[PDB]
Design a protein around this motif. Structure first.
Motif, PDB file in Angstrom:
ATOM      1  N   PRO A   8      15.929  -7.870   6.216  1.00 53.15           N
ATOM      2  CA  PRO A   8      16.517  -7.113   7.335  1.00 53.15           C
ATOM      3  C   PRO A   8      15.858  -5.767   7.592  1.00 53.15           C
ATOM      4  O   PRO A   8      15.940  -5.264   8.720  1.00 53.15           O
ATOM      5  N   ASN A   9      15.219  -5.169   6.587  1.00 48.02           N
ATOM      6  CA  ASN A   9      14.762  -3.789   6.654  1.00 48.02           C
ATOM      7  C   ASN A   9      13.250  -3.642   6.589  1.00 48.02           C
ATOM      8  O   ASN A   9      12.756  -2.511   6.538  1.00 48.02           O
ATOM      9  N   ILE A  10      12.508  -4.743   6.585  1.00 46.38           N
ATOM     10  CA  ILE A  10      11.051  -4.745   6.604  1.00 46.38           C
ATOM     11  C   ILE A  10      10.624  -5.519   7.843  1.00 46.38           C
ATOM     12  O   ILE A  10      11.139  -6.614   8.095  1.00 46.38           O
ATOM     13  N   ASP A  11       9.703  -4.953   8.621  1.00 49.49           N
ATOM     14  CA  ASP A  11       9.264  -5.583   9.858  1.00 49.49           C
ATOM     15  C   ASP A  11       7.925  -6.291   9.634  1.00 49.49           C
ATOM     16  O   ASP A  11       7.425  -6.380   8.507  1.00 49.49           O
ATOM     17  N   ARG A  12       7.332  -6.803  10.719  1.00 54.75           N
ATOM     18  CA  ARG A  12       6.172  -7.673  10.580  1.00 54.75           C
ATOM     19  C   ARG A  12       4.926  -6.920  10.137  1.00 54.75           C
ATOM     20  O   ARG A  12       4.007  -7.535   9.585  1.00 54.75           O
ATOM     21  N   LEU A  13       4.862  -5.614  10.382  1.00 57.06           N
ATOM     22  CA  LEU A  13       3.687  -4.819  10.060  1.00 57.06           C
ATOM     23  C   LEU A  13       3.814  -4.105   8.720  1.00 57.06           C
ATOM     24  O   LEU A  13       2.976  -3.255   8.401  1.00 57.06           O
ATOM     25  N   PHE A  68       4.382  -2.689   3.282  1.00 51.44           N
ATOM     26  CA  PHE A  68       4.224  -4.002   2.676  1.00 51.44           C
ATOM     27  C   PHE A  68       2.968  -4.680   3.210  1.00 51.44           C
ATOM     28  O   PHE A  68       2.650  -4.589   4.399  1.00 51.44           O
ATOM     29  N   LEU A  69       2.247  -5.356   2.320  1.00 50.30           N
ATOM     30  CA  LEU A  69       1.156  -6.239   2.710  1.00 50.30           C
ATOM     31  C   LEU A  69       1.587  -7.697   2.730  1.00 50.30           C
ATOM     32  O   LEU A  69       1.171  -8.454   3.612  1.00 50.30           O
ATOM     33  N   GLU A 122       0.846  -1.181   0.000  1.00 48.65           N
ATOM     34  CA  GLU A 122       0.000   0.000   0.000  1.00 48.65           C
ATOM     35  C   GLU A 122       0.888   1.239   0.000  1.00 48.65           C
ATOM     36  O   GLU A 122       1.909   1.280   0.700  1.00 48.65           O
ATOM     37  N   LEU A 123       0.490   2.255  -0.761  1.00 49.27           N
ATOM     38  CA  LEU A 123       1.156   3.549  -0.718  1.00 49.27           C
ATOM     39  C   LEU A 123       0.113   4.637  -0.509  1.00 49.27           C
ATOM     40  O   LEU A 123      -1.011   4.539  -1.008  1.00 49.27           O
ATOM     41  N   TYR A 124       0.490   5.668   0.241  1.00 49.03           N
ATOM     42  CA  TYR A 124      -0.409   6.758   0.581  1.00 49.03           C
ATOM     43  C   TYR A 124       0.327   8.079   0.439  1.00 49.03           C
ATOM     44  O   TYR A 124       1.528   8.171   0.695  1.00 49.03           O
ATOM     45  N   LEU A 125      -0.407   9.106   0.021  1.00 49.19           N
ATOM     46  CA  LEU A 125       0.146  10.448  -0.100  1.00 49.19           C
ATOM     47  C   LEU A 125      -0.463  11.328   0.975  1.00 49.19           C
ATOM     48  O   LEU A 125      -1.699  11.444   1.038  1.00 49.19           O
ATOM     49  N   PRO A 126       0.334  11.965   1.829  1.00 49.76           N
ATOM     50  CA  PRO A 126      -0.225  12.787   2.904  1.00 49.76           C
ATOM     51  C   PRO A 126      -0.678  14.152   2.404  1.00 49.76           C
ATOM     52  O   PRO A 126      -0.402  14.564   1.276  1.00 49.76           O
ATOM     53  N   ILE A 154       8.949  -0.057   6.476  1.00 52.08           N
ATOM     54  CA  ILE A 154      10.214  -0.130   5.760  1.00 52.08           C
ATOM     55  C   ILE A 154      11.112   1.007   6.218  1.00 52.08           C
ATOM     56  O   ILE A 154      10.666   2.152   6.342  1.00 52.08           O
ATOM     57  N   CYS A 155      12.383   0.693   6.460  1.00 56.72           N
ATOM     58  CA  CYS A 155      13.426   1.708   6.551  1.00 56.72           C
ATOM     59  C   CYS A 155      14.013   1.884   5.155  1.00 56.72           C
ATOM     60  O   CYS A 155      14.568   0.936   4.585  1.00 56.72           O
TER      61      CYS A 155
END
Ligand SMILES: [Cl-]
Ligand SMILES: [Cl-]
Ligand SMILES: [Cl-]
Ligand SMILES: [Cl-]
Lengths: 153, 983
Positions: free
Chosen positions: A79-84, A72-73, A56-60, A87-88
């Motif tokens: 190493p750089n993506i967590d469970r939720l 990410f869904l 998913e991507l969102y624009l503020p 992303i760093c």
């Protein structure tokens, strides 16, 4: 800064279908041009190469003065993506301006998949695995790719 | 941290005296008083007169004939309960001044008396400031004496940065492309530089900026040999400065300039102002009478002779400026709210520097004019009749602009968004202007915020009696107290200006308006109002302040850029990774502590309550929630702990301390040891990665203690062990007693070894057994010192700071960073509002020469004043039809069908519409597939929107903006405006 947010979004969407980036799709929701559904193919010669990953991507409110939000869904071992899905990403953080665009964010994510960075980790366990136990960690990334990602054509 | 204290808290030495209490005197005094000082003393025995009310907002017609100083004292006292305001009975000899630390002489004090007062103050060690305003002209003079020292020139936080490489020669290169932000001549010290031992001892080094990412130091082979790491910190060294007396400066002035384009004028006006006094000497105390050529030419002669008496003021070969001095004489009697407010803020800040020692004083003269505020004399002739008095409070504004232009100001229709600090000063300026006071004029002020005190009675329209009421209402009524001519002309609404209120603020409302003024901080409201003003083609007056800095921007239809076109980029956000594991600044630890507050004391309670009250909570949470595990773990931990006594709240806080500042840190070092090497081959813990050490709880360490105190108290709130009631000045003994008897589980590194969710849900207790059980969620209130919230955030951040060897911060500094508190001081607010009201005059004359307008920037720390021509709106061209990218648009009648629109653009303009959107909804695209295109191409816009949004138009709508992309006659893409569909 642009005078209108939806105008900027329109200009980027037209060019996303006109001049797409290989291995990446990005398409907005008709009833909300601020939400984009995204998929990225795993780069060839990487643990993820047989999979397709959803984001998913969102624009503020203040885009393009403010960088997009991305999550990410697809469950992924990285190493750089967590469970939720967080992303760093070097582009998301320090380096942002109106000059950068959704295109550049997606290119950056694709490249993070090609070339993970446990030296600057977000998922600390996966980072340990990648530094101490690299081949095994990569293998777990492969397993997870076929387990949770969708298959390529 | 704070605003300015310690060695810079000399303002509680400082008694200020202000001589002259017309508009200039009150503006100055108000600003000073609001700021805070030991005492304010005012002196004006002259009797009030109607004319005085042009800019003197604390005077009413009941006061005519009484002493100004007496009738202003009470109202200035209201402003700050902590500042005593007195009246000097009489000023008969100079030695009476010795009781004051700063003396200010405004437009009411003769130059002869200014020279006398100043010689006395300078030789006696008293700081002197003077100021004068003359129509659209003005000046100020500062003389803080022989030996003034600047210890904090800019007031801004000292710049710091991480070092990557330093050679035997200077050349300090930074880490991973970072700005040092230093200028040439700065000085820096170093810490943590390995190898170069005594280079870390506090020694200073002059900085030659050879690049934006590097700078030069010199020879550093004597301190050691650089190994790795390091941090630099700027230090501001003292600067000794000398001020010359007023008499020395009258013939040898040192100028601080106010406008790049007007550098020369400062030497002219310096003479002019002097001649004005010389004129009053010859004419029984009177100034040149208005628009009078006899007195004007007498002034030209006085100046012409003064030039020979002071050859160094103009120099060699420089002629006197007849026309400038002529206008000075014409406007001598003028009293203009904008100029008076400008100099009020400016001069008040100089007084505060003289009281505090902070910032860099003005050295020593500054002159200013705003002659381009003058309307077109063709439109509005200026002569001795048109400009003559009328026995009204506006007479000294008529003196400059003439009665007809002033009447137009009365019959203007204006919209002010926001009634904050700038909004209040704006309503004051407008009250003094009589703006919207005519029968065909009005004002609309709107703000949906409420009143609440800041620190020591800030805000000069709001009082303790007003707390809780609306800002717009109280501000409107206050300025009506200042000028009754505006009674019943201020429409004080309490609506939000955005999409949610477009049926209140509609076509009619906006099209009636002459212009708009914005007094709001947040970027969303500002871009919305700006885009409204672009849509309705209205002029917009924008302003902003950031502490001692401020700016003004004019947006002129069909002429200039808009606000959104040039708005500044928002503040950097903290990278997630650095936040979670690798902090290097107190900002990171503060943000992390805030997250933890949210989770401990707000989120967990809300989740427990939902689970206990709702019957399908578990099922639903399984169906639709990203962080199912987090929610359920929160609930189960909250209910498995169950504290029955405050003893257990203390125990819980202590165990959380161990978890977060010992075990989690040990787990992190387990994953990446301190000497762990990356795949690269270099250390893992390099650069902004500082290797932490786990903490050992020590109740005598203040941060450990207050973490336990605040956490135990807030958990006691959650579980109803203590409401807002506890003697919160605790003793270490009470908590040490509980903590020394605890067993602290040893660190188990959890490398020990659908599926997990089912175990969680099995663990959850049966709500029937928790009958009548409720958790009371906390709500983060920062402006309440009783509640332990800032205590918790400060202590949590500081323990994490101890982990990564980041230096701690106290409650006030932590509050500043955690609140994102943006400073708002009275000086800058009044000044910037004054400049806005000076451009307003140009709007009234409907000026269209962009060179006549002035965008303004100020930094009262230096002090710096600068003005710049607004930027022209960008313009383009698609089929040789040139257009204005900001303001131009296409216009279309009726609810046209999409196909007719496409055809109309192919025929009339030659354009091939590729994209079309309404707001956030995409309505048509060139790449849309056949089935999609057919259902839409034959639809009216209103129904097209109904199809995409699945929601029909509210019906109050009459107009519709549509964005489009299109190709030209060749087939290649061209840029184009937006489309207005009129229903
Ligand atoms: Cl005078
Ligand atoms: Cl030096
Ligand atoms: Cl100050
Ligand atoms: Cl009038």
């Amino acid at each position: 800064g642009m005078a209108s947010l939806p105008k900027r979004i329109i200009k980027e969407t037209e060019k996303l279908v006109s001049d797409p980036v290989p291995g990446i799709t990005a398409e907005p929701h008709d009833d909300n041009l601020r939400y984009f559904q995204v998929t990225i193919e795993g780069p060839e010669q990487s643990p993820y190469e047989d999979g397709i990953f959803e984001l998913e991507l969102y624009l503020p409110d203040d885009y393009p003065m403010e960088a997009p939000k991305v999550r990410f869904l697809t469950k992924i071992y990285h190493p750089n993506i967590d469970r939720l899905g967080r992303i760093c990403l070097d582009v998301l953080k320090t380096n942002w301006s109106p000059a950068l665009q959704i295109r550049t964010v997606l290119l950056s994510i694709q490249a993070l998949l090609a070339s993970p960075n446990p030296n600057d980790p977000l998922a600390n366990d996966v980072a340990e695995d990648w530094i101490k136990n690299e081949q095994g960690a990569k293998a777990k990334a492969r397993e997870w790719t076929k387990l949770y990602a969708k298959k390529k054509p | 941290a704070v605003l300015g204290k310690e060695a810079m808290l000399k303002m509680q030495t400082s008694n200020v005296l202000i001589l002259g209490l017309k508009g200039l005197g009150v503006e100055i005094a108000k600003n000073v008083v609001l700021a805070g000082v030991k005492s304010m003393t005012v002196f004006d025995p002259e009797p009030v007169q109607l004319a005085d009310l042009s800019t003197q907002f604390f005077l009413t017609e009941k006061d005519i004939g009484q002493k100004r100083g007496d009738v202003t004292r009470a109202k200035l006292a209201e402003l700050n309960a902590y500042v005593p305001v007195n009246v000097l009975d009489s000023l008969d000899d100079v030695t009476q001044l010795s009781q004051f630390q700063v003396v200010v002489a405004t437009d009411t004090v003769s130059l002869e008396d200014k020279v006398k007062i100043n010689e006395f103050c300078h030789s006696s060690g008293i700081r002197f400031i003077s100021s004068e305003t003359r129509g659209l002209f003005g000046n100020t003079f500062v003389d803080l004496g022989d030996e003034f020292t600047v210890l904090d020139p800019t007031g801004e936080e000292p710049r710091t940065g991480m070092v990557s490489d330093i050679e035997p020669d200077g050349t300090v290169t930074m880490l991973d492309d970072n700005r040092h932000g230093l200028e040439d001549g700065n000085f820096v010290r170093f810490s943590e530089v390995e190898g170069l031992d005594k280079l870390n001892d506090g020694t200073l080094f002059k900085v030659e900026v050879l690049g934006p990412f590097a700078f030069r130091i010199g020879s550093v082979k004597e301190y050691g040999e650089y190994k790795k790491g390091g941090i630099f910190t700027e230090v501001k060294v003292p600067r000794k400065i000398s001020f010359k007396s007023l008499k020395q400066q009258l013939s040898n002035p040192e100028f601080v300039f106010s406008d790049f384009a007007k550098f020369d004028r400062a030497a002219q006006l310096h003479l002019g102002f002097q001649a004005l006094h010389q004129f009053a000497v010859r004419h029984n105390g009177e100034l040149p009478r208005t628009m009078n050529d006899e007195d004007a030419n007498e002034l030209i002669k006085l100046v012409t002779d003064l030039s020979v008496q002071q050859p160094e003021v103009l120099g060699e070969g420089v002629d006197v400026n007849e026309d400038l001095i002529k206008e000075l004489s014409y406007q001598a009697r003028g009293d203009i709210p904008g100029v008076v407010a400008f100099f009020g803020g400016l001069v008040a800040q100089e007084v505060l520097k003289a009281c505090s020692g902070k910032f860099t004083p003005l050295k020593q003269f500054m002159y200013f004019d705003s002659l381009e505020s003058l309307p077109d004399p063709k439109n509005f002739p200026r002569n001795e009749k048109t400009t003559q008095p009328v026995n009204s409070r506006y007479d000294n504004q008529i003196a400059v602009f003439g009665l007809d232009f002033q009447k137009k100001i009365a019959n203007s229709k204006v919209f002010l968004v926001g009634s904050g600090a700038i909004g209040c000063e704006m309503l004051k300026n407008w009250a003094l202007l009589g703006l919207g006071s005519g029968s065909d004029g009005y004002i609309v002020v709107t703000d949906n915020d409420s009143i609440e005190k800041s620190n020591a009675n800030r805000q000069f329209l709001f009082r303790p009696k007003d707390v809780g009421k609306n800002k717009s209402e109280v501000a409107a009524e206050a300025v009506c107290a200042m000028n009754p001519d505006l009674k019943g002309k201020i429409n004080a609404k309490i609506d939000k200006v955005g999409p949610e209120t477009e049926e209140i603020f509609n076509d009619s409302f906006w099209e009636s308006l002459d212009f708009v003024t914005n007094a709001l901080d947040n970027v969303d409201a500002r871009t919305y109002v700006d885009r409204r003003c672009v849509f309705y083609r209205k002029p917009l007056l924008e302003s902003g302040t950031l502490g001692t800095k401020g700016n003004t921007q004019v947006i002129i239809p069909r002429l200039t850029e808009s606000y959104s076109s040039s708005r500044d980029p928002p503040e950097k956000s903290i990278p997630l990774c650095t936040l979670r594991s690798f902090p290097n600044k107190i900002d990171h630890t503060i943000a992390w502590a805030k997250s933890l507050f949210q989770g401990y004391f707000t989120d967990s309670a809300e989740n427990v309550n939902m689970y206990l009250t709702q019957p399908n909570f578990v099922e639903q949470t399984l169906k639709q929630s990203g962080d199912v595990k987090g929610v359920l773990e929160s609930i189960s931990d909250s209910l498995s702990s169950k504290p029955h006594n405050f003893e257990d709240c203390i125990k819980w806080a202590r165990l959380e301390f161990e978890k977060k500042f010992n075990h989690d840190i040990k787990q992190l070092l387990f994953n990446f040891p301190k000497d762990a090497k990356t795949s690269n081959g270099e250390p893992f813990w390099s650069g902004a990665k500082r290797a932490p050490t786990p903490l050992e709880f020590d109740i005598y360490n203040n941060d450990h203690f207050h973490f336990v105190v605040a956490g135990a108290s807030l958990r006691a709130y959650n579980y109803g062990i203590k409401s807002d009631d506890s003697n919160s000045k605790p003793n270490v003994d009470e908590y040490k007693s509980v903590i020394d008897h605890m067993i602290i589980p040893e660190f188990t590194p959890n490398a020990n070894l659908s599926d997990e969710i089912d175990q969680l849900v099995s663990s959850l207790p049966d709500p029937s057994t928790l009958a009548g059980f409720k958790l009371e969620p906390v709500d983060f209130e920062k402006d309440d010192d009783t509640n332990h919230h800032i205590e918790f955030i400060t202590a949590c951040s500081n323990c994490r700071a101890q982990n990564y060897f980041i230096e701690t911060a106290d409650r006030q500094k932590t509050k500043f960073i955690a609140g994102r508190i943006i400073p708002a001081i009275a000086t800058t607010t009044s000044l910037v509002t004054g400049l806005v009201n000076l451009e307003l005059y140009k709007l009234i004359d409907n000026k269209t020469d962009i060179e006549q307008y002035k965008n303004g920037f100020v930094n009262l720390a230096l002090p710096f004043f600068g003005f710049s021509e607004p930027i022209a709106s960008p313009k383009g061209e698609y089929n040789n039809k040139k257009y204005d990218k900001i303001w131009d648009r296409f216009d279309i009648k009726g609810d046209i069908k999409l196909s007719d629109l496409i055809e109309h653009f192919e025929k009339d303009e030659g354009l091939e519409i590729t994209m079309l959107s309404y707001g956030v909804s995409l309505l048509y695209a060139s790449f849309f597939p056949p089935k999609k295109l057919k259902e839409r191409l034959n639809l009216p816009i209103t129904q097209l929107v109904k199809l995409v949004t699945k929601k029909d138009i509210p019906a109050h709508v009459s107009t519709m903006i549509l964005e489009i992309c299109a190709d030209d006659k060749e087939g290649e893409d061209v840029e184009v405006p937006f489309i207005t569909i009129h229903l």
